[PDB]
Amino acid sequence: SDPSSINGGIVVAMTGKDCVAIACDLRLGSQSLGVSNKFEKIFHYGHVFLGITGLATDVTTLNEMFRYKTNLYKLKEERAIEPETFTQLVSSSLYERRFGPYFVGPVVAGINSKSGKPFIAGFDLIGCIDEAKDFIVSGTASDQLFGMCESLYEPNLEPEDLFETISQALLNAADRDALSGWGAVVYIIKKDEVVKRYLKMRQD
Amino acid sequence: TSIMAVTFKDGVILGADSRTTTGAYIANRVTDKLTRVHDKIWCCRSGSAADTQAIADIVQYHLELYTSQYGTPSTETAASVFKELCYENKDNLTAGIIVAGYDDKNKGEVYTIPLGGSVHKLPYAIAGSGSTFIYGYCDKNFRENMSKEETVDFIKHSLSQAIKWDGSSGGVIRMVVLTAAGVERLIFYPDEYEQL
Amino acid sequence: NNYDGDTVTFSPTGRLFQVEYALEAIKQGSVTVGLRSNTHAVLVALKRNADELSSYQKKIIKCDEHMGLSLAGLAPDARVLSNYLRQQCNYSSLVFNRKLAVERAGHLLCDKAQKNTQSYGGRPYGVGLLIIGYDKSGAHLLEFQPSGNVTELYGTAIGARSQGAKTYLERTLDTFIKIDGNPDELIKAGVEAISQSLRDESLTVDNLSIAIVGKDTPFTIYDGEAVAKYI
Amino acid sequence: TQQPIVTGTSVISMKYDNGVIIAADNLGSYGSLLRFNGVERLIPVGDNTVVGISGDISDMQHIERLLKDLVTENAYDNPLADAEEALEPSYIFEYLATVMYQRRSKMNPLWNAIIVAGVQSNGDQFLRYVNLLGVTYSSPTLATGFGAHMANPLLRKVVDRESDIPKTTVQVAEEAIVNAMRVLYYRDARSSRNFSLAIIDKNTGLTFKKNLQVENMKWDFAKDIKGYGTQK
Amino acid sequence: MDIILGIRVQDSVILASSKAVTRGISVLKDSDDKTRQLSPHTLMSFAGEAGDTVQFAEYIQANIQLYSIREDYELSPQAVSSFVRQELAKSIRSRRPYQVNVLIGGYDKKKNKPELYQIDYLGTKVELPYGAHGYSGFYTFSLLDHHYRPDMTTEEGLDLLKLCVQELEKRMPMDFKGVIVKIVDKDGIRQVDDF
Amino acid sequence: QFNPYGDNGGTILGIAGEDFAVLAGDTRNITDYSINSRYEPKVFDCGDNIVMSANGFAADGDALVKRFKNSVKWYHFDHNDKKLSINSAARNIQHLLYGKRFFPYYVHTIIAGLDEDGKGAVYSFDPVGSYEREQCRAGGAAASLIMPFLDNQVNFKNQYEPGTNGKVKKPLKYLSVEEVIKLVRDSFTSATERHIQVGDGLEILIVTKDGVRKEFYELKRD
Amino acid sequence: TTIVGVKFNNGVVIAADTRSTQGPIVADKNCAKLHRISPKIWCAGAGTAADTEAVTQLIGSNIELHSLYTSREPRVVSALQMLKQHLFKYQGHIGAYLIVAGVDPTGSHLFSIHAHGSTDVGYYLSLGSGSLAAMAVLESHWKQDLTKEEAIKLASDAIQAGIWNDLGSGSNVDVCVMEIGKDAEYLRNYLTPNVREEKQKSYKFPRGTTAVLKESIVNICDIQEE
Amino acid sequence: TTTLAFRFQGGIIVAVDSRATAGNWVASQTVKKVIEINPFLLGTMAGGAADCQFWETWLGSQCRLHELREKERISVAAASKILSNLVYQYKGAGLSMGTMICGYTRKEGPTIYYVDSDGTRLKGDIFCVGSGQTFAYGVLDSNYKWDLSVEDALYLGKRSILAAAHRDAYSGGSVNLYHVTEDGWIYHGNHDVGELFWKVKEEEGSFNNVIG
Amino acid sequence: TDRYSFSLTTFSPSGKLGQIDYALTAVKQGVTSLGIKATNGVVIATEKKSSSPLAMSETLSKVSLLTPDIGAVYSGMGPDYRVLVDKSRKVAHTSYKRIYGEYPPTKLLVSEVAKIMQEATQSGGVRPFGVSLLIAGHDEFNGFSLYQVDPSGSYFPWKATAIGKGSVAAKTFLEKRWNDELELEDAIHIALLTLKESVEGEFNGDTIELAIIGDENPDLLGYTGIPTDKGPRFRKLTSQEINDRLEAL
């Protein structure tokens, strides 16, 4: 059908004060049939976190693509790449294959080490940088995510207010969507310390 | 949209409207459809808008170089340049150009190029898509070898009819006059011919 | 000095030495004599074998059903040109329905030879061809140099000891043009001509090769028992 | 792809004892509008061959370009190529043929139909046909387009086969071609009163008679007809 | 299409592929193998589009063996899977795709553990303790949740597999004429002659 | 749009003799309901005792015939005036057809002459290549009118003896070239009546080992 | 997306919305839409969201090249003629509809460019989905010879017409005012209509509300050595 | 069209019919569909007449050329896996194939391979190909025996084609028999379907849809 | 055309490439140029020379801007400097700026210009560049930074350095005047002063070109209203400005 709804997937991302959090589901389907409840859609190059939604194979292709580009950045200029600089590379890689593109929708989430600001950004198929300082949502339960996320969220949250909001936001769209859910992992990204917390949730 | 050019005793006078419709919404209404491609050889553009302009830039590049190496082009020369770009990309570049100009040796000449790209010399030309309403007017009341005053009214009066019967023709009537005296622009606003 | 192993460099005496050296490829080749009239042209060639058990080297090459070339230079170099003449003969027939003119076929030939004498790593062709043919302008005999220069002649020769044949023809020049409609004699006057280039080489049924072209004859090569009535 | 845009009418023709006649009219219609009048479709080539072109006006112009280059090409080298190796009609034909085939293969055709009308140096008549499919044939009567089934029948009633070419003289042929322009002019809805005419003879050279009109039309009958059948 | 199940018990990967091959209206051959030995302890089973399958199974087996004779050390299942993933990625961007679904089972002698992997026609690698491709998949992923236990032995695992086959045999309206079983384990790659 | 192939009709009949060959075809040249020309050959001599006809759509017919008469020329040139067999002509023709298989030729091509047993051969090809040595075969529009008749009179197909009643097949006939020629014109007279793509002129190339003879005979013109 | 570009006596003022959409859903309440070819050549873009941002970045690249290769200011025409040429090759497969504006030494300019390579010139042009609405307001209030303080008001009310009546347009209204031989001023968030009310309550939650299955700490740091 | 081969313990009987078509009418009935690749390999023409006839002759170029380089006549398996690779380039270019390359070598015995348009390459020991492949299978497979005689295996071939000829519209003409031994193929003559039909019926007392 | 596809940079028999050494010879013929890296800027200075006094040196650029943060200054051939400044601009934008959205770090751009040097020792038909550049710049991660790119194709980071015909004298003077802490006003005071013991023609602000990569300017940016962007840290000083500071030596 849709080339970005044939295995589903979602990514939600939110900012708080002095922290960000990003989270994905763990579902890989082939249409109707569930194949796996343990495929990641979040990856980490350094202290940047890149969540990638959309078609199954291009999540994986694109992970090893940026794995290649992040290595050459770090080696030449002798530091881990910053969130803001990286966002520009996520845009260009999509745009190079302007026709017949990568059928993804990534989410960049970090906290800059040079300024200490939460910073997040988004992309469509072709990739238009979507600034925010709220939250950016992407995937196949994104219509639901945009409503749900906005309603709970209060501008700026504490590092563990932020775990309760982005967890509920993700659960409630994911159990009203058919191609999302089925086990999920929520990350809380503070300055220097990332915790990966799997979530108890509905498998049916 | 209506474009025309008429030969007369002192040279050739070019004529255009200024409405460019796309759909029902008029994008621009002060369009200057009369383009200089040398300095005594001006053209008239009609048809697919981006594809006429693209060609014209290339023709301009050809003639600027032609001047600089071989000497000044003629109406004939410029029209030829035009034809061979429409002719060799004739499936996808869709252009009706009227190339009109004043030579210092042969006076005014007019060529008409339709969408296939075939040159044809004419003592006045009309091409467009608003010029299918004034076809019978232009032939009956036209005379070859008219004095200046007459010519300017002949092209006004036709475009006034084109405006009236074609709603893809409108706004200002622009005329550029090419003569040995030089290069003179006239502009006629709507009350000035809607009066008639 | 190094003007002589470079085909791109002159030569303070205003030459190139390579085309000249290439012109000496013709002198060490074998002899051939051509003579033509207004209705028939003839090539009379002396083939030359290496030893007793070796065969004799064909020296008239059929180019078409009305065009023939004969070498007198080096054989490997002649195999590049023979195709080229065939190629432009079939292209002229194919496209323009025209049995390729002899005179125009010379002009093509020039420019193939020139473009390798202009270019380094290239060489002038060491072969020099005599090219006969029958078109609507009549019969013609061309002499092609390694230079790429073509000239049009009542009769000529190239090879080894070519000068003596040119003499036999310079005399007998005004006899054979006024022979017309009698190929028998035209063939006979060239046998006497190539006999002045011998030096006890004789002419047998294995040495002599004649080929003719007519207004009533296509291209034919006689050899074996067909030149044994013209010894 | 290429499909017709601006199109001519028909070029019509027949053989007679000492040469060939060929005639075409002066029209570029752009469908409904009959937009170019006095733009000629017969192109004399050489000095004894008239090559009459139907179909596309665009394409036709660009094949006149190649004919002119071809006279330039045959003249080169040789001074006797304007006397006894001139451009024969079979020559002008062969190049036009071969061009059509090769353009057909790349699937962008030069959309024309050509008659190549002449007389050989041998004195033989030559009238030979090519079209945009690449098809060739000779006949005693030949016609492009719509005229290949309108004009062609009338012409072909004078010369039926290859043994009435000797018996058809320059004056019966002149008449038949005039007549067939007029037959077309009634029943063909893209036509023009002006037409050019060439007459190719084997002793007076090529004569190129321009700017004839069609006359002696019938209309005298049309005051009698009233209604469509119910109305009288 | 054709059956293609994997099941990874604590000491062996048990792969199975269908015997029957039906090209045209008629089964033409009834015992054809649909596997290729890549490495002594790495096995690849295939089913997919007729005539892509032969070329893609033999292509990958040339390249993996070349890499093995070079270092004299066979690549992990983990590695094999990724190289497999990579070509299928490339093939849907290319003019005509290879649409060949493969289950890769290998014994990893470096973790000293058996491992199973699933790579679909699009090129998605997934580790899984059992897997399946095509319509075959639909009847056995549910039946396998019921009886599978991670700590099983091989002979337990063989009777589970003959349960799986049995369920397919009735409920599938396409004949497969039973499976051929091939086991991949640390003593080599062996076969079972019982269905 | 563009459509790149037509049809120009006509029909051919190649009959492989026993010591002769005959290749006949009508010379009627048409497009749609128009008669282009009364007479315009569809049987071409190629020389070296092989006749060739490609009938179908004219434009391919002219070019593939043409590309064969060069492959004749080049053979004489580089293999040094060796004889070109009918048998070697066939194999060669197959590559000419097959060279274009994606924008293919449109003509049924039949060749005939005498090969290296001195017996008549006719080889007939399908448009994208393939060929088969036949004893008789037709091609073209009207070919299925002419074929089942020719099978009746030559190969005596389905004719049994009188008084046996099927227990014995009717004995074969040794032919001469005039016996056959009679039969060609008549089968064509039928096809012309009963089909609209046949008529005008009938042109019969005969190959004998004494040279290639060309004999014209008229049909009805309709 | 409502984007006006209004020429005036001493310059040009170009203003746009802050809404970026992805389908019917509002991606971003506030996002930039005015981008910078060159410091004196601004542009805003309408049509397809990625192909606005990249094509500006790209002819941006080559002009910056070009301005420094010539040791002179980069002209409005320089930009215009490269855009134009570049868009025509793909024959209108790259979806961008830009209002291009700017000042240079040879005066004030204002252009519009379609996705193929039509270019028009008025003293007021608009592109977007808002185009229609924008344009209406302009033709009533506008005259020849407007002052700055006049111009900016005309630009603002013009985008506000855009917001009320077009749904592809909304949120805040951005302005950038350029005058000839004076610095180019970016007034992002000039005029804010549609200021979001207070939500009826907080939807904050006590600790422990959701259920964790497991927890871990995962490392973003390099390997250390004691 | 209906083409078959089956191994037994003497080698491989290859049998084909000789009528082909175009349209709904008999184009030819003189066509032989047993294309000699080698004098030790027989290949069959089914599907498209041109494509099978062209390539199978090219395979025999590459077979002849193999013998020269390695000084050793090719295996049956090596022949098939040249053709499969070549074919597979022309996939999605409209190329239809449908051949079996059958050979007897001393290192493989009798072997049959089927090659396909698609580029499948299957080994197996009874392969029936054509529009009438359904009707060949029946008679073959109900009386197949590995331990079979050479007189009896040519008659089992004969009869699989004669059922197929009878019921399929497009088969007919003649039946061709080949016995492939180690020392190359022997041709076991031509049997017209016209003459054959009524002799088999008189002998076996089979056929009793058909009046008699 | 071409018919050269073999290097003309070749090793000598006792080692060392002959050609990269010769190319370095052409550099020490040329003008004297210096660069002093301070804690808050980098100052660079060079001397301007003309064919004749009828030639202007105000329309000639012996200091160029590559990006708004990283400038260049040379000693060596004028022509080689010209092409090597342009190819650097083109590769600065095409091999990083498009992709990463910001201008290259000073180190990263230095690294790129060093491969261009390399491909004019390597690859047939070419000879090495005949300039040594100082590429001074500022990036966010190395602070201010000074490099010296040479025809060899290697680069070395410096604290202050000299190249040209006065190079040996210059660096002996620079040894004694480099201090750990140098303010931007002090840095200018050493660099003019060093260059003055390497001048024997006219000494005026019209013959001495000086450029600072000091600290940033929101007045040569061309706009205001984005506080992310802070203008050119590169700022070439006109003749008059340099001239005030010559009277204050």
Side-chain angles (χ1 to χ4, degrees), chain G residues 35-51:
Chain G
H35 308 281
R36 184 190 62 77
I37 308 304
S38 285
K40 300 298 192 186
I41 300 172
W42 285 64
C43 54
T48 291
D51 293 340

Side-chain angles (χ1 to χ4, degrees), chain F residues 131-178:
Chain F
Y131 67 86
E132 287 311 310
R133 187 159 182 191
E134 311 95 342
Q135 71 292 321
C136 187
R137 188 64 44 242
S144 39
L145 285 68
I146 294 183
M147 177 191 306
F149 188 52
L150 263 289
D151 297 307
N152 208 32
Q153 297 284 276
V154 187
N155 313 330
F156 283 140
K157 188 189 68 182
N158 316 301
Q159 293 192 25
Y160 305 111
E161 286 277 77
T164 70
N165 292 244
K167 305 193 282 182
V168 171
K169 292 199 167 183
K170 180 158 284 185
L172 303 160
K173 188 177 184 160
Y174 190 71
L175 299 162
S176 189
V177 65
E178 301 307 304

Side-chain angles (χ1 to χ4, degrees), chain A residues 95 98 126-131 134 143 146 150-152 157 161 163-164 168 194-196 198-200, chain G residues 25 27-29 31 49-51 53-54 93 196 199 203-205 207 209-211 213-214 216-218:
Chain A
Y95 205 80
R98 162 57 174 84
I126 312 307
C128 171
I129 328 172
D130 286 342
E131 282 80 66
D134 289 78
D143 301 290
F146 258 116
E150 190 47 293
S151 309
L152 305 174
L157 299 178
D161 284 273
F163 175 64
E164 320 292 313
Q168 287 181 21
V194 178
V195 278
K196 175 167 189 175
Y198 283 62
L199 282 189
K200 185 191 160 70
Chain G
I25 307 273
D28 307 290
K29 296 189 301 296
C31 223
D51 293 340
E53 290 181 17
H93 278 328
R196 200 207 179 177
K199 315 189 287 157
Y203 292 91
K204 281 173 144 302
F205 299 104
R207 315 287 186 276
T209 304
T210 53
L213 174 71
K214 52 187 281 87
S216 53
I217 321 186
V218 288

Side-chain angles (χ1 to χ4, degrees), chain G residues 36 38-40 42 57-58 60-62 64-65 68-71 182-188, chain I residues 61 65-67 86 89-90 93-94 97-101 103 219 221-226 229:
Chain G
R36 184 190 62 77
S38 285
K40 300 298 192 186
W42 285 64
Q57 182 175 27
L58 192 66
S61 207
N62 295 106
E64 198 75 290
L65 296 178
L68 183 54
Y69 189 80
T70 57
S71 312
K182 296 184 192 87
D183 292 301
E185 38 174 41
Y186 190 37
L187 314 167
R188 187 173 185 171
Chain I
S61 298
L65 175 159
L66 294 181
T67 76
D86 301 322
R89 289 151 169 181
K90 166 171 72 66
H93 287 206
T94 53
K97 193 185 175 297
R98 292 169 176 197
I99 303 162
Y100 290 98
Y103 302 97
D219 52 85
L221 183 53
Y223 64 99
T224 36
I226 288 178
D229 290 325

